[PDB]
Amino acid sequence: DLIPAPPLSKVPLQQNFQDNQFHGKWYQVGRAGNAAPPMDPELLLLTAQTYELKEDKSYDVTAVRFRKKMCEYLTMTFVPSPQPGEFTLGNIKNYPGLTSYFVRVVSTNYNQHAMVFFKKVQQNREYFSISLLGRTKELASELKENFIRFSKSLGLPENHIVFPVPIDQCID
Ligand SMILES: [Y+3]
């Protein structure tokens, strides 16, 4: 049932990560991961996220999506770990069935695009995912192709990579 998570050696880490340049609003322009494609195609609408850099240097990351006529929000806290650009999950004891959570920012120019890699253990199944983030709702096709390449290098097939359609509700 799941494509194996890749060894973390296959996942680059953005060098000299600057938390205060990575903050603020991003659109999840590309998604890839071993989780199954959604059965509800309404989840294929573009979401937005805010990486709110807090006083204690953790981020309170809030994602919004449009679903069933409403804006649905979810906030999680990313606690910086010893390597700049890597994070674990704040107060994981508050998340039922979620036992492990890891974030690595793979690459970014801060002002246009980012790729962020996630690996978590939920119900003792190991999931991984990669997000392509844009400061605008659309990105250059060469960036989308690079994201596909990268996703396939971690063992993902084309049907586990998707490019959500920009919407105006909730996210702008
Ligand atoms: Y997500």
Swiss-Prot record:
Q: Which SUPFAM superfamilies match?
A: Lipocalins (SSF50814)
Name of protein:
Neutrophil gelatinase-associated lipocalin
Coiled coil regions in record: none
Q: Does the keyword Coiled coil apply?
A: no
Hey, what tissues is this thing expressed in?
Detected in neutrophils (at protein level). Expressed in bone marrow and in tissues that are prone to exposure to microorganism. High expression is found in bone marrow as well as in uterus, prostate, salivary gland, stomach, appendix, colon, trachea and lung. Expressed in the medullary tubules of the kidney. Not found in the small intestine or peripheral blood leukocytes.
UniProt superkingdom: Eukaryota
Query: What Pfam families does the database record attribute to this sequence?
Result: Lipocalin
Annotated enterobactin binding sites: 101, 129
Q: Which residues are glycosylated?
A: 60
| Record's subunit section | Monomer. Homodimer; disulfide-linked. Heterodimer; disulfide-linked with MMP9.
Q: What is its main location?
A: secreted
Recorded family membership: Belongs to the calycin superfamily. Lipocalin family.
